[PDB]
Amino acid sequence: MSAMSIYIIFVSIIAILFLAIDLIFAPHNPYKEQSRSPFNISFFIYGLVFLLLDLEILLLYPFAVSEYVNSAYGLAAALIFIGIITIGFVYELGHDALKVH
Amino acid sequence: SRHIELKYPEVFSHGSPFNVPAGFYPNLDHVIEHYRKQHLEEEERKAKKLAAAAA
Amino acid sequence: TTPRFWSTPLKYCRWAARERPALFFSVVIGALGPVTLATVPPLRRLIGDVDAAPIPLTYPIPPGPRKQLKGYDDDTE
Amino acid sequence: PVPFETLIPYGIIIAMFGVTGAGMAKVRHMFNGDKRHRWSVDQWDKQQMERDRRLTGHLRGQTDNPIAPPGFEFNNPWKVXXXXX
Amino acid sequence: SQISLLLLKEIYTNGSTHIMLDILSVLAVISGICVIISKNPIVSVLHLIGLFAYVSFYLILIGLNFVGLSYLIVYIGAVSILFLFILMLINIRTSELQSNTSNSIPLTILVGIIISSFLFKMLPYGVIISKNDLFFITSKIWDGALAENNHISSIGNIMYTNYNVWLILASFILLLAMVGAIVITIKPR
Amino acid sequence: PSRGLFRPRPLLAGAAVLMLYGWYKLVKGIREQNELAREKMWARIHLIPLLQAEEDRDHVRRYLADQAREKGLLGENIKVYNSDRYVRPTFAVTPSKPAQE
Amino acid sequence: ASGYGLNGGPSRCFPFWQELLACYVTNSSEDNPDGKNKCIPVMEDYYECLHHRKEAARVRALQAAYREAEAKKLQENPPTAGQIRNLGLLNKEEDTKKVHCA
Amino acid sequence: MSYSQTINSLVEVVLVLVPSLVGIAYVTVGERKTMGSMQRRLGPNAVGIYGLLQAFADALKLLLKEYVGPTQANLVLFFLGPVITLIFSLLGYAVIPYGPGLAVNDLSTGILYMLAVSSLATYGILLAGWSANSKYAFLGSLRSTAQLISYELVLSSSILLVIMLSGSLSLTVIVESQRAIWYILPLLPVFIIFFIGSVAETNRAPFDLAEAESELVSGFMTEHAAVIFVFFFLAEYGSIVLMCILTSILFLGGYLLISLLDIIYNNLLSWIVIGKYIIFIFPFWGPVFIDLGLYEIISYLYNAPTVEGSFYGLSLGVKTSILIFVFIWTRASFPRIRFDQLMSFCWTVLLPILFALIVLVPCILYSFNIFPVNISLL
Amino acid sequence: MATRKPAFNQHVLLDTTPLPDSIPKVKEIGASSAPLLSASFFIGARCKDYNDDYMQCKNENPGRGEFECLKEGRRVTRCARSVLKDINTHCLEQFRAHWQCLDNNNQQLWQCRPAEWKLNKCVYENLKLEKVIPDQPKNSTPVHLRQRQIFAHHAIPPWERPFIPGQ
Amino acid sequence: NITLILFLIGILGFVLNRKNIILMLISIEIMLLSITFLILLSSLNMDDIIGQTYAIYIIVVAGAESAIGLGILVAFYRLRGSIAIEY
Amino acid sequence: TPTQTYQFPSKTVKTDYPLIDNDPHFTRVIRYARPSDYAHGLAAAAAGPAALWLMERISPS
Numbered sequence A: 001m002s003a004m005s006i007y008i009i010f011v012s013i014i015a016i017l018f019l020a021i022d023l024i025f026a027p028h029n030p031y032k033e034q035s036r037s038p039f040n041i042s043f044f045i046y047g048l049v050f051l052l053l054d055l056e057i058l059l060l061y062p063f064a065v066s067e068y069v070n071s072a073y074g075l076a077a078a079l080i081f082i083g084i085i086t087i088g089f090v091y092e093l094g095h096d097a098l099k100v101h
Numbered sequence B: 001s002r003h004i005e006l007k008y009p010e011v012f013s014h015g016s017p018f019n020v021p022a023g024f025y026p027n028l029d030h031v032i033e034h035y036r037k038q039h040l041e042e043e044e045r046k047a048k049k050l051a052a053a054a055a
Numbered sequence C: 001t002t003p004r005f006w007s008t009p010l011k012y013c014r015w016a017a018r019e020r021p022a023l024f025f026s027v028v029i030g031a032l033g034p035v036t037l038a039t040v041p042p043l044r045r046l047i048g049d050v051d052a053a054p055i056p057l058t059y060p061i062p063p064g065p066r067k068q069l070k071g072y073d074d075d076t077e
Numbered sequence D: 001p002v003p004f005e006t007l008i009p010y011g012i013i014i015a016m017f018g019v020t021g022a023g024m025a026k027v028r029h030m031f032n033g034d035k036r037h038r039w040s041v042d043q044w045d046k047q048q049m050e051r052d053r054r055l056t057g058h059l060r061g062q063t064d065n066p067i068a069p070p071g072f073e074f075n076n077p078w079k080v081x082x083x084x085x
Numbered sequence E: 001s002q003i004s005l006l007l008l009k010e011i012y013t014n015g016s017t018h019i020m021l022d023i024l025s026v027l028a029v030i031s032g033i034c035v036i037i038s039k040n041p042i043v044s045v046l047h048l049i050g051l052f053a054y055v056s057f058y059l060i061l062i063g064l065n066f067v068g069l070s071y072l073i074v075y076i077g078a079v080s081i082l083f084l085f086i087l088m089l090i091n092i093r094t095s096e097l098q099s100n101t102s103n104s105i106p107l108t109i110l111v112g113i114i115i116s117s118f119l120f121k122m123l124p125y126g127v128i129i130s131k132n133d134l135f136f137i138t139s140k141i142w143d144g145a146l147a148e149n150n151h152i153s154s155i156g157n158i159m160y161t162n163y164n165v166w167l168i169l170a171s172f173i174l175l176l177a178m179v180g181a182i183v184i185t186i187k188p189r
Numbered sequence F: 001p002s003r004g005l006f007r008p009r010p011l012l013a014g015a016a017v018l019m020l021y022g023w024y025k026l027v028k029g030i031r032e033q034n035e036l037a038r039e040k041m042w043a044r045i046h047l048i049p050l051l052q053a054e055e056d057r058d059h060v061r062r063y064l065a066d067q068a069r070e071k072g073l074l075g076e077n078i079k080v081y082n083s084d085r086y087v088r089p090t091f092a093v094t095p096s097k098p099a100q101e
Numbered sequence G: 001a002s003g004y005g006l007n008g009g010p011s012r013c014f015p016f017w018q019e020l021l022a023c024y025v026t027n028s029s030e031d032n033p034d035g036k037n038k039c040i041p042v043m044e045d046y047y048e049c050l051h052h053r054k055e056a057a058r059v060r061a062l063q064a065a066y067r068e069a070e071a072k073k074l075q076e077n078p079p080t081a082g083q084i085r086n087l088g089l090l091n092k093e094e095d096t097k098k099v100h101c102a
Numbered sequence H: 001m002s003y004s005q006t007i008n009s010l011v012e013v014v015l016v017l018v019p020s021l022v023g024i025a026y027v028t029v030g031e032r033k034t035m036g037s038m039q040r041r042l043g044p045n046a047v048g049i050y051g052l053l054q055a056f057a058d059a060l061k062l063l064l065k066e067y068v069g070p071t072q073a074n075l076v077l078f079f080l081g082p083v084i085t086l087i088f089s090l091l092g093y094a095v096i097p098y099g100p101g102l103a104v105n106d107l108s109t110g111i112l113y114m115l116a117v118s119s120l121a122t123y124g125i126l127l128a129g130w131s132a133n134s135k136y137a138f139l140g141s142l143r144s145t146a147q148l149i150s151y152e153l154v155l156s157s158s159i160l161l162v163i164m165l166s167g168s169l170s171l172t173v174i175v176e177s178q179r180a181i182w183y184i185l186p187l188l189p190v191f192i193i194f195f196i197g198s199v200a201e202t203n204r205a206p207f208d209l210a211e212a213e214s215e216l217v218s219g220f221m222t223e224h225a226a227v228i229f230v231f232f233f234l235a236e237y238g239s240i241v242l243m244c245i246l247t248s249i250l251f252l253g254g255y256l257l258i259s260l261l262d263i264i265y266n267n268l269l270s271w272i273v274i275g276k277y278i279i280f281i282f283p284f285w286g287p288v289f290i291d292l293g294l295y296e297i298i299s300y301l302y303n304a305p306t307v308e309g310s311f312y313g314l315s316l317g318v319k320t321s322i323l324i325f326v327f328i329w330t331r332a333s334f335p336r337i338r339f340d341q342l343m344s345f346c347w348t349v350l351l352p353i354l355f356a357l358i359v360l361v362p363c364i365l366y367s368f369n370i371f372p373v374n375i376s377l378l
Numbered sequence I: 001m002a003t004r005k006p007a008f009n010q011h012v013l014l015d016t017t018p019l020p021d022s023i024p025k026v027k028e029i030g031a032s033s034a035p036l037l038s039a040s041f042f043i044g045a046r047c048k049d050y051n052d053d054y055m056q057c058k059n060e061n062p063g064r065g066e067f068e069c070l071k072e073g074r075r076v077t078r079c080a081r082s083v084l085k086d087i088n089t090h091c092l093e094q095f096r097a098h099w100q101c102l103d104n105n106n107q108q109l110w111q112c113r114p115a116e117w118k119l120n121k122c123v124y125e126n127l128k129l130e131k132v133i134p135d136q137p138k139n140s141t142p143v144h145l146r147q148r149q150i151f152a153h154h155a156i157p158p159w160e161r162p163f164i165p166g167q
Numbered sequence J: 001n002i003t004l005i006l007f008l009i010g011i012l013g014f015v016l017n018r019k020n021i022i023l024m025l026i027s028i029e030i031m032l033l034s035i036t037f038l039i040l041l042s043s044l045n046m047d048d049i050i051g052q053t054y055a056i057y058i059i060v061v062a063g064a065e066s067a068i069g070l071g072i073l074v075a076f077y078r079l080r081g082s083i084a085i086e087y
Numbered sequence K: 001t002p003t004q005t006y007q008f009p010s011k012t013v014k015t016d017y018p019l020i021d022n023d024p025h026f027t028r029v030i031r032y033a034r035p036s037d038y039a040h041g042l043a044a045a046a047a048g049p050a051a052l053w054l055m056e057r058i059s060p061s
């Protein structure tokens, strides 16, 4: 079989064995024994800006593994793509959208 | 019109230039001659238009 | 307290370099990218550092008519 | 002074990384026919090794006979699949 | 004299099994219903995280490594995390999100039959290609293997030059999602 | 008790000279890699015609066999493409069972 | 039809598409309405390159005739896989002859 | 091939996983022993001859401890949630080369494989703090999740600068490119930004205040969800070691070790076939190395596959160990940053610098004709 | 058959049917991957015209070049067969030393410079054939003729000298 | 056939939903995944890298609508206090 | 004469005057520009700020 497959199974098996020791040996007991408040908008912004910048950085990864062919024409277009995304970053820096300062 | 004229005839120049196998790309010299005729006819038509009416 | 760029642009550049260093030098390093692209290559070709030709990424077909070779035929099997 | 007793765990980690690399290169050396393994392989390299199995039977086998053996013009493998396309 | 066509099992270049695709598709379907039936919106999003990974694995298993990894990095890494944030913070009463699904059960048979019976015919032969059975034959090439590129390198070769207008329009779509989302949510200054 | 090991002026100078030395060594190395790549490509180009020729006889062989296998079985050859181009096969006829092994 | 394939290019059906575009542009104009009819076969070749329906149909038939022909003829001694893994090897000439049945 | 692939696969998987698991268990002993030398005390020295069984007792003690998990409307989150956190922790190891192409998987998109495993890791923190029965503690898990997503962008934007110099996402190719120079020298700022991001991603001090305040508001009526699981600790230490190996792959030499053969070749000029091996140097003399006894054995022992593989692992092992030291030294050196302050550091200091360097580096690469080829070479 | 890389291939289909008698026959090359790469520059030094005719021919017949370019393929395999025969007859000792090196070096030329330099001096003296990489930069030493190789796993000894054709 | 099944699932998410406006966000994404997966599988069948590019841009636009949508849902929640439809 | 004066398929546009270039280089466009183009460009340029000033005097912001 492939090494990747046998590796995932082995990691899976080790996890089962460590779990089994807890179930087999560790002590067990049958006895296993409402408000509202606004949440900070900051939590939304952290995932929002991450999601957008993560996509933009992702779109740049193909350029890095194709630079010999993209060359000067590709560099130019990738710089125009960098500049547009940077201007959006300066906007979140300008409005302290992250509400960190 | 029942005929479509390509807005982008430069699609004939499309195609990856890498890892090209011999005999993959078709010969399009007859396409090139059709588009050459068309350029030459408009050049001449205009030349007749602004030289036979400017005298 | 803090300067105004349009009113005093050189005194702002000193204040931002001292008071907003991470931001100021991001804008500076960013500008050094368009500078290096407009200066180094002219200086490189001034001293004779030529660009390498592109490496082959397709079989290099020869231009022109075929050469009508003779030799290595079936009789030479 | 040097507290060597705190350095002992660090030597174990270095020795562990050493024995992984030591043993992995040994089993890939015996896997490849008592010869060093191939690394950044592409469609070309993989096809070049398939033709090594055509001439010798081993994906890493090598021979410099200018004349291919009889039957070599028939053992060219055409892979058959059921789903991918 | 003997059969000219000969069938043999490959030994060290034997690829993967078609079965894994029937397993992943069944898993993708099973988690798909569990998304639209679960009472808790949290559990639905978790079953959605499960679905996105089954499809990602199917793509990686059929050779689409960069897009499958991209799906894993974007959908599970970022899109669903934003879904957990909003869901784990909004006050959700689960009784107010439950509706009598049985009232809607007759329209589910109707809509499923009609939509499937139309869209299926529309697909191309190669999507529905899968008792004598066809097998897909493949052979090797040399001129087209000189400098083979990974798919990301091939996407990169054309993404920033020939089809660069798509990058420009997408950069402005992301730019709009940045400015617009901040303007509708944050209190200025 | 100020010490020069942590004074900014020696540190920036030391960090700067390290970056220039590494940028000199990166310039030379990638230039060598790109010339090693040129020799690798020319090496595969001089071999591509012999390798493609042996493949081409194999494609001619199987196609002429399949054309004959049909004429002996179905009574004629069913034309797939209206053009006379050679299209590399997508599907093939296979024996019902593999070799016993 | 884009002309760029998964491995660094080009695409497998791109030759048929250029053959189709060439046919339409060079035979069909506003003067002659039925010039495009010379394109009907060329379009089928391109729809067939992408989807392979007609080829699948030829193979399903030819494969059914082949299997119904080799399931009734007498078999002498089928070659084992190990024999057909030694075919064309430099030291197994005996097995190559058995595979070739010469 | 010579033997069965399935055996080959198993031998490689055990040779990588078992020595890596014993190493992750000595990083825990090493943290305590290092912090104690810097804090003028000793580390563990009692459970074991030199405290070398301390990890084993602590790991075994947790396993035999009763778990008080609520199990209320949850029998899949408690017993299948944390288990996959540990599967994700070990998944990144399979792309680690202990030599040229010596990995379980030699993957061309090896870098994008590691980014995918990092994005999956964020779930364990988010789900671990879901069982926290506190208003502020639950919020601390979201804040820790927000620190991971933010510093992942720093890590992914920084890796993009190595890929620009290397041309490939294969970890083997990335190391082989460093034969010209280690990436720490030409990308010095990028390295120090990557290391800080890696500490923040691992949620270690001085970047752990979010998850630290959680233990302060528990009260006298609640409990935590890490009372007996060794799973999360193994995931944590495994993540630290994996981050250090990746840092050494990208910026130090990876498995590349300075070669004496090159240094001795340049200096030596009096080659002698009689075995004397005279040297044309000022401290040189006439060596008496035995051709039949020493030189023959030494030459063969240099080119043996086990020896060369052993010194490539030892190189990568030394460099990971040095970086593990910097993690422990950093924890023993600084106070904790507040969550707001770390968020400003990521978003108003390190990301603007990275984006500026993202512009600059390809501009310099084009200017000096130094774009690498993206075909399979090296 | 299709040039798509396979993902779930478990079986191989062989065809024992030979070529028809009408096609003139050829003896296929029997050298493996590593011997071919050792002699790749020697084959392109002599067979370049025939290698170029074959590619130019197939180009002149789009979609029909596997057939319609057979005789040219037979000429390329005879010419390449003549170079492989010549290295065996004269350069056998140095030739094997070179490609057995490439066997354990990932088939990477920079890893085996000393063996190639000694093989280059044997071929040039016996067959007058020289290795030319086209369009190499003029401001620097040719990479194959450099005393130091940066990406080499093992250092090149100073006494091992690059072969320059005439010095 | 898997791509059509998942497209039904996203569609049936709208068929079976009277109260969840969150589940309509989820069902839109299941429909986008099915359409991208169809383009991706047909791309491998035609040796076309442009399908992979179109899939990538559908993933970017899909995330951008998720951001625009969950932001609008946050604006709505701030003033309403519930994301529940009074049915 | 290179023997291929028209080498690429190009779009013909119905215009009123002879085509010189479908894609001139930037330096040539500046070089062939008439002094009227300079007046027209500067006249439009100033029109933007001048509209904002006039709009300030009449309806104050």
Ligand SMILES: CCCCCCCCCCCCO[C@@H]1O[C@H](CO)[C@@H](O[C@H]2O[C@H](CO)[C@@H](O)[C@H](O)[C@H]2O)[C@H](O)[C@H]1O
Pocket: A016, A019, A020, A023, A024, A025, A026, A027, A028, A029, A030
């Ligand atoms: C994950 C892979 C699949 C699982 C593999 C391992 C399965 C193990 C199953 C058996 C576990 C036995 O573990 C054992 O369970 C019993 C019953 O709950 C516990 O018994 C406990 O609860 C019972 C409840 O009636 C009490 O009467 C008893 O006094 C108390 O000790 C033991 O304290 C515990 O040690």
Ligand SMILES: CCCCCCCCCCCCO[C@@H]1O[C@H](CO)[C@@H](O[C@H]2O[C@H](CO)[C@@H](O)[C@H](O)[C@H]2O)[C@H](O)[C@H]1O
Pocket: A086, A089, A090, A091, A093, A094, A095, A096, A101, C023, C026, C027, C030, E189, H352, H353, H355, H356
């Ligand atoms: C390639 C990298 C390029 C990096 C470019 C850097 C961006 C430069 C432009 C943006 C910074 C200038 O924009 C400026 O942002 C700061 C920080 O929020 C704001 O700062 C001010 O407002 C915010 C919000 O009330 C307060 O929290 C802050 O304490 C106060 O000082 C300024 O009101 C704004 O004018």
Ligand SMILES: CCCCCCCCCCCCO[C@@H]1O[C@H](CO)[C@@H](O[C@H]2O[C@H](CO)[C@@H](O)[C@H](O)[C@H]2O)[C@H](O)[C@H]1O
Pocket: H024, H025, H028, H031, H032, H035, H039, H055, H056, H058, H059, H230, H233, H234
């Ligand atoms: C697979 C093997 C490991 C499985 C899990 C085994 C248990 C792992 C957790 C223990 C590992 C050490 O973890 C770390 O140890 C040190 C003890 O020096 C503790 O540190 C503690 O003691 C030191 C004493 O100087 C104090 O200064 C510090 O304030 C205090 O927090 C840390 O709180 C703990 O996070």
Ligand SMILES: CCCCCCCCCCCCO[C@@H]1O[C@H](CO)[C@@H](O[C@H]2O[C@H](CO)[C@@H](O)[C@H](O)[C@H]2O)[C@H](O)[C@H]1O
Pocket: H085, H088, H089, H090, H092, H114, H115, H117, H118, H121, H122, H124, H125, H155, H156, H201, H202, H203, H204, H208, H211, H226, H232, H233, H235, H236, H238, H239, H242, H243, H246
């Ligand atoms: C660009 C990155 C490329 C390489 C990516 C490698 C990813 C490896 C991370 C997988 C492991 C999961 O991620 C890791 O999980 C553990 C527990 O869940 C976390 O550890 C957390 O829990 C443990 C125990 O509960 C605490 O002692 C610790 O203070 C806390 O940080 C780590 O903060 C996190 O780093």
